[PDB]
Amino acid sequence: KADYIWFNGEMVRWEDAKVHVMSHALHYGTSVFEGIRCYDSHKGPVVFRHREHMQRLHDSAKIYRFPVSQSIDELMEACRDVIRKNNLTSAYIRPLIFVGDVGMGVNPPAGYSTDVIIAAFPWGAYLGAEALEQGIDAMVSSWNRAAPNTIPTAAKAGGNYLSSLLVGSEARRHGYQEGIALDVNGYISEGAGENLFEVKDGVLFTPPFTSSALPGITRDAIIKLAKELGIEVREQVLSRESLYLADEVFMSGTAAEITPVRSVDGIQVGEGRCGPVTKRIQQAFFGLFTGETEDKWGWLDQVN
Amino acid sequence: KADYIWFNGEMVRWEDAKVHVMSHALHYGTSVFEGIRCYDSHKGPVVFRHREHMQRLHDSAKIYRFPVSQSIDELMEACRDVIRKNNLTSAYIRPLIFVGDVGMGVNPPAGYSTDVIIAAFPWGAYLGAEALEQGIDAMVSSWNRAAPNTIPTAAKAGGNYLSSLLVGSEARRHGYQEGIALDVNGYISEGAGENLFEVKDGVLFTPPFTSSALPGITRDAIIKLAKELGIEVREQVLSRESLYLADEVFMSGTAAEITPVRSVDGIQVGEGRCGPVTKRIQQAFFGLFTGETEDKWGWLDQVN
Amino acid sequence: KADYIWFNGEMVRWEDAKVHVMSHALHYGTSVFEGIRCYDSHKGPVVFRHREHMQRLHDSAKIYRFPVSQSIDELMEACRDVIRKNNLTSAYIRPLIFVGDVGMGVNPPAGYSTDVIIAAFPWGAYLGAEALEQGIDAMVSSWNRAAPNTIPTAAKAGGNYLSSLLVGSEARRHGYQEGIALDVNGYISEGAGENLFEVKDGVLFTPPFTSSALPGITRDAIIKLAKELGIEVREQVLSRESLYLADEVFMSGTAAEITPVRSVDGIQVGEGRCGPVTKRIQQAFFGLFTGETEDKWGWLDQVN
Amino acid sequence: KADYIWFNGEMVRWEDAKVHVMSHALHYGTSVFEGIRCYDSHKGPVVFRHREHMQRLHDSAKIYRFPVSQSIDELMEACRDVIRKNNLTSAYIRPLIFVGDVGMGVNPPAGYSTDVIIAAFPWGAYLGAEALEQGIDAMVSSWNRAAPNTIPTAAKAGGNYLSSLLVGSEARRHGYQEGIALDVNGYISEGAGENLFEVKDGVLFTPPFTSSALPGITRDAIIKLAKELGIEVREQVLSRESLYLADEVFMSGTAAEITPVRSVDGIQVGEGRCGPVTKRIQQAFFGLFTGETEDKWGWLDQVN
Amino acid sequence: KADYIWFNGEMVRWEDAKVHVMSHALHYGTSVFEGIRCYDSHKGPVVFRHREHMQRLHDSAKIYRFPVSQSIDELMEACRDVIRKNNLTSAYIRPLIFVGDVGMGVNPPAGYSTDVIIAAFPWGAYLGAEALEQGIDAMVSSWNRAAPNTIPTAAKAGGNYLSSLLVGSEARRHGYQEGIALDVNGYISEGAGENLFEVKDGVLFTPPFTSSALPGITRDAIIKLAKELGIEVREQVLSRESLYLADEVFMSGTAAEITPVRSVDGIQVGEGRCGPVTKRIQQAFFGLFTGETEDKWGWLDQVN
Amino acid sequence: KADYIWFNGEMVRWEDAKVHVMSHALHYGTSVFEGIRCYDSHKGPVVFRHREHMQRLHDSAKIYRFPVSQSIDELMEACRDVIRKNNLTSAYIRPLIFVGDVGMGVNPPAGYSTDVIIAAFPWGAYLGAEALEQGIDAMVSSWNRAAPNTIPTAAKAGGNYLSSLLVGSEARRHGYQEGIALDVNGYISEGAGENLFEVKDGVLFTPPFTSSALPGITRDAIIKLAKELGIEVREQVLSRESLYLADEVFMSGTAAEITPVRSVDGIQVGEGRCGPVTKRIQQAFFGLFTGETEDKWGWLDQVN
Ligand SMILES: *Cc1c(COP(=O)(O)O)cnc(C)c1O
Ligand SMILES: *Cc1c(COP(=O)(O)O)cnc(C)c1O
């Protein structure tokens, strides 16, 4: 929780950010969202890969043809505003575009417009406080992720999350911290809400987008950092068994950051601790906020 | 629109039926809903297959493990209440169970409870005023319906509708009234929001639930009425070409009722008008509210 | 070979029935055809299920949207004409509608019309003289039949036959008489150019159309005859192994008529001879031309 | 149209290039063909990648086991002959090998031989005169391309085109210039008769042959030219959504040459005009016939 | 354990029934087996559906082309002998045909013969003592059963069980008594080593063999018993969610007999105890050994 | 055959290495094995990639959760011992870990242990004496290899071989030396018991592990050797037709070593003899045992 929320152009007090119960998105999952993080750094509060997330918000809405009034720059300025306004140095930002109080027909009437919301608030490690250091225990779920030409997995839309709910809850019900989903073909897709990486003989592996895996921005950052460290990266389809044969395995995401996976299905991964390559990558990633890692791509956007 | 909405046990003015913008269902599609119809009949206002719809509401919530405080009888009494309170003789009722203002984690915290809403209001023919008589022009969509073990198609959940949105909007964008989706295997599934039936040589055909088709209550009623009329019904997988070789084809649903399909992909179906078997079924269905058709199953629930 | 061929409305001498080498169908497989048989019977020459084949010719062209000038009755009269004209008592008739000398673009220009041809000539048993009595040796091919929503298997079109060529030639190259194809899922579809039936514990089994099997008219006749004989018929998906466990197995088609399969992949079927149920069915089928079997459906069309 | 056509070794007047209506290829799609282009250049008339096309003609025939009497050099000499004989400086050449007047059995009798035809004539831009400059509007088809082990997509055979007909006609029926087909898995295959390329962040992307995409010779030329220009090329499986997120997208083929795609499914691609990378490639391609681009591979075959 | 084992025609003492460690079956899973039960009844010791099991033994070996020296009658006689010789009144019999000490090449040399073994011994309820009365808790496995045309699921061969090991161990590792596997399409196949049945609205449902389910002999008996009791049986494909919506669910097998399933994935089935229809079937089944159920089919084979 | 076999830590005479007929592995395919080769070289008897094979033995058992008492070093020491003890200078070693005489339940009781066996003996070329020089004739099988998430293809387990038996026996039954299997998608997987390679335009191609191909150690060696020779290697999915268009094709495996394939399905590959690239690779491979090829990786383990 925080003080204000940007709602359609104006800062509104948290308690007043309400919407009608007949809002389209509540009944039909018609919304698109993003997960962005603001980190306190050596240059003060900074939003990580800000433009890239806002660009993806526009891309997700474009696929579903949701009209967006605000431009990427407007959304970026609004985001910074929310952080200053709430006096946050570090936080989790949540942009949400949704179809509001329009008719009850599945297809909204021509000429309608969407409601936009940007909320910021402090949020710790998604998979746990000690998760980044010690790693987590994952389980391969019995539920598969969406098939290729059904519900576009490249779009970060609300309705998609019924799948993540099923995958993740099943893992947690059995004592695990997160669940790993396979696609309809039986290959590794990704975790319930985070991308999956494997390390084998010093080489980094990740499933392509065609494995029903969302084009993670953290995923993209890791691939670029790895190339700077001189680590070979291979984007290819991975079998289920590969999880038991890999030297290391970890998950990535905005909320999950970079979490090591110490075991899968009760089978220990390597030494059962955070691996050496995962460590190098974590150090290089968090080094961006200390100044140890040079921001060569302009991933740090100053809030001021 | 109407005057009141049942919200968590009490009648609230329509305009005051608001919910926080950080409600789980707005971000993750975590909601379950129903479509029920109240018809003005020879016995006064009557809710069609009321218990069955409320039973399915509980079933959809059960699959996702959403806790429901209200029993089927409570929900039924609340439904009748909304209709009387709003002075409606005929209307479309919309029960909605959703995960409210709880955390932002995909998996709701233990001990949470859902919010329930029941709204009633007048609503005409989903596919058009003259649709029931003249029929509509459908198009086979380029988007497929959800694969079998991904997002359960037997549950009527909010997030599911991103698919119906894609299928339906594509058809309407090209001049058609509705779109027909095929499953991932290339077989007929159903319309964007209505079951599909075909008539060939006096025999009724419908895809099974395993074709990613939701277990329609109108679909079930039609199969039962058809058997009363002495019409053979075959529940089997159907190829795409069957739509072009069928003597008749129609759609079923609570909102769509029984709508004839006069053409598919520009190819005329039979005579290009409502067929004889579809006619028989329409008369038998609507006859329930006139008294011509005996309600042998107890499908009519008096509102009083 | 015979004397005349019906070509676009007029009887032309066989040798003169030529068409330009730039005819669309030669380059793009754009043609639809039928296989019909005329049998010498107790009522004289009679065409078997004449209207049904002509109706299917129209259906196949309809799916591909090929314009057909002739009506079903015109085509039927033309067919009878060809048989009388050539003095045939028994023969194989071959109706062929194809896209002729039009442009070279894949999609023919609007307003074009198709060329129609009807040729009749004597033709023995497709799988061999002794095949109907002793049976044949079949082999399951390594090539699969067309997937569901790619090239419609319900249409009897020319281009489809590249598949039948592959399936059938492979079997014959290895010493077998015919090849049996599986669909993309690994279930039994049908032979290269004939439907497949299995007999197990007195029950008849056949794959549905959804197994990429063409809706055979001989197949349909057998199903109806079987029901008259009090034989249970089950139209369901069949596994590959079922061919080794079945008591009997046979193929059906216009050209192949009813051919028993004595072995599959070197594994003998039952006694390695024509089975009892297959025999009953053959007797009932050929009995239609002797008068022993009453033509209750009007399958025999007199040529006069 | 032109004056002569090479038919089985000798130049025949166009109007006399006839074949019997009972030719195997008319009924069973048993033919293999090529699309070659002759360009007027700085070195006079020149056939683009002549040997490669004739080599593929032999390869397609080899897969189906069609006997070819003519060697690659004979076919090349005959091709040049047709161009000179018809006084063409620029034209579209169409080599066609087909199973002629042999029996009516699906499998041709042993010892048979095929008929060969080579026709040349002027032909403009396949997708339109202004298509190369302005680009076209494409639509993702509801029909999928052939599954992997059914009808070999690597062979350019006649029967294959029933699929291209379905995909292309559907697009044109809805106001689009061309249709893009997905494979049975739901991934991008290619256009109805042209390969598909996408540009994203300066990188070129194309589906592999395993996506049911024919090994285009223009496709191969573009990949080689791109590498000369220092553009990274990635041959990988592509999701349907990628078409909406791509900076640029274009089609390639002998008849279509290099056509930009300005929109897909009503969604604008980048700027809605020919993109910068597509431009570079177009200039480099057409530069071959001006002398600006050095023919390092020996792609230009002088007709003389 | 017992005193003797029938080994290649002769009664050998249990302790001496050894085979070389280089036996083909030990390295390549090349064996076929059966599970048969001998019950103490009102007619004394009786082997349940003896011939049917031995017939299936021959069928499984036939699929793999393993040569069997003994006829069905000899194997039945041998089975009865082992039961008498070991003084058993009730027991579990295990016939096993395997490729013995032959070469190390995958394909055994021509002219080889198999080794046959028949061991009998007392064996309680597979899923537990109180499992038949109380029911068990099942879990849907993350591992799928063999695809249709890979390793024939209709054959009861040794190598198949690597799959059952994976499915069953996963369930037991999480606190469940048995695991339920889905096929590659995402539909219900069966338990790790027992067929699956569902009861909904008084109707019995079971997946067909094409769902990668072995043709259970107990399954076949239940279907026939149910028809005697006037219970409708439907053999059709079932979705995963159906397990949560079913009134009752139970498993069948020789070793498992008829075990009720009180919960699936933590979701209670009906009342959480053995259901009414399951009970009727159990009573009818076990009634065969008391005389209450008339053996109309000749399922009880006297040992003497 | 040889004199001794290492059995659970002790050298036992060949004839005495027996196990009970009720051993779990005999009935359920519950075993894991390796194929290793000892070559007579310039440094004396040497085991090729010894550690890698023993490492994979542990990996296969780990996937199935079979407990292994011996460490990789103990197994390597045991392997060398057997070779010395049997006075072998060149041989084929066969390590086999299997579930022994434990209960008859599919899941072995907790606390059980496995039996380990290591047998060594002389063994010639798997596909024939002159196969390495002349090449073999292969056939594409009608049986497909295991689907992705069913029975893990990355594990070299006993039960897997029912598939290899079917694929290989079918080829041999038709006059071929080996069969090539496609996966469930219709793409090339590998031979019945050896990996598959293709050479096209001087480039090496091999299917990835996700094509249901086991991670061959010989396959891995060839890829590394090829990179040393400056030959481009591409690990990608391959279509069936690619076998007919390839310049060269060969198989790899411990027992098969490097065997050229001169024809596939009766279609000659290239020149019909061992190709140039295959030859270079063979010479480089066998050169390791002569000293001509430097062992840069430490692949040769001295027996002493
Ligand atoms: C958002 C998301 C991720 C993480 O992506 P980032 O862009 O790295 O935040 C991973 N998986 C799924 C399913 C997601 O929706
Ligand atoms: C609700 C629904 C239907 C219609 O079902 P009824 O129970 O008859 O209202 C059809 N298809 C989908 C996708 C639906 O959600």
Ligand SMILES: *Cc1c(COP(=O)(O)O)cnc(C)c1O
């Ligand atoms: C025509 C055909 C048949 C036979 O059908 P009939 O209508 O019985 O002549 C069977 N299979 C295929 C592939 C066919 O095209």
Ligand SMILES: *Cc1c(COP(=O)(O)O)cnc(C)c1O
């Ligand atoms: C011929 C063809 C192409 C274009 O290939 P080019 O060799 O470049 O002429 C593309 N797609 C299909 C289906 C084709 O047949």
Ligand SMILES: *Cc1c(COP(=O)(O)O)cnc(C)c1O
């Ligand atoms: C043997 C078996 C069964 C049970 O079959 P019964 O003939 O009833 O003993 C069920 N499932 C599998 C996988 C089996 O092997």
Ligand SMILES: *Cc1c(COP(=O)(O)O)cnc(C)c1O
């Ligand atoms: C063992 C095996 C191979 C060969 O692997 P190598 O490690 O090279 O011996 C190939 N295919 C299969 C199916 C195998 O089991």
Ligand SMILES: CC(C)CCC(=O)O
């Ligand atoms: C809520 C998360 C599962 C998804 C967005 C993120 O990674 O922040």
Ligand SMILES: CC(C)CCC(=O)O
């Ligand atoms: C909007 C509709 C598709 C909802 C279901 C119904 O009420 O029929």
Ligand SMILES: CC(C)CCC(=O)O
């Ligand atoms: C030629 C045949 C394979 C097909 C048509 C028929 O059955 O007559």
Ligand SMILES: CC(C)CCC(=O)O
């Ligand atoms: C008509 C075209 C699709 C043929 C291929 C080409 O010439 O490009």
Ligand SMILES: CC(C)CCC(=O)O
């Ligand atoms: C272990 C069991 C699954 C074997 C088969 C049976 O007896 O039911």
Ligand SMILES: CC(C)CCC(=O)O
């Ligand atoms: C029989 C062989 C396929 C076993 C593995 C090998 O040694 O290559």
